[PDB]
Design a protein around this ligand. Structure first.
Ligand SMILES: *C/C=C(C)/C=C/C=C(C)/C=C/C1=C(C)CCCC1(C)C
Length: 133
């Protein structure tokens, strides 16, 4: 399904370290940053998304409209400029972040009562699974 609305609680986080290392996030930050408790709050109205990610480490909010390119300056992350675009491939929501890193972006989809998130950068893939709260 394309409906990703809801409050989503992390139940699995695979290779977040590899993803972060591929982003060149500094070592001390990576040691903290990985949290197995993470809440993703998604408000979806038509093509407008408001996404908020919360953990005890840091909170990451982004708003976007599907099919509208938007520049990002990833200050809270690896500190880079990218050109972001979020589109649908079937029922998979795909973000491509064009810039220095190849294969940078994410894919998000709903399968049953679960939200799946694949974060990619370079040859690294991080896979996260969330249960609807
Ligand atoms: C639709 C889902 C989206 C837009 C999620 C994107 C999430 C991130 C870019 C999250 C990054 C981080 C954490 C979840 C932990 C805190 C540190 C970050 C920034 C690496």
């Amino acid at each position: 399904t394309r409906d990703q609305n809801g409050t989503w609680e992390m139940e699995s986080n695979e290779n977040f370290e590899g993803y972060m290392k591929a982003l060149d996030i500094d070592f001390a930050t990576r040691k903290i940053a990985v949290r197995l408790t993470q809440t993703l709050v998604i408000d979806q109205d038509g093509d407008n998304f408001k996404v908020k990610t919360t953990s005890t480490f840091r909170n990451y909010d982004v708003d976007f409209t599907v099919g509208v390119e938007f520049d990002e300056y990833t200050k809270s992350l690896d500190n880079r400029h990218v050109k972001a675009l979020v589109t649908w491939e079937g029922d998979v929501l795909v973000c491509v972040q064009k810039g220095e890193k190849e294969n940078r972006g994410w894919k998000k989809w709903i399968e049953g009562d679960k939200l799946y998130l694949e974060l990619t950068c370079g040859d690294q893939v991080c896979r996260q699974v969330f249960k609807k709260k």
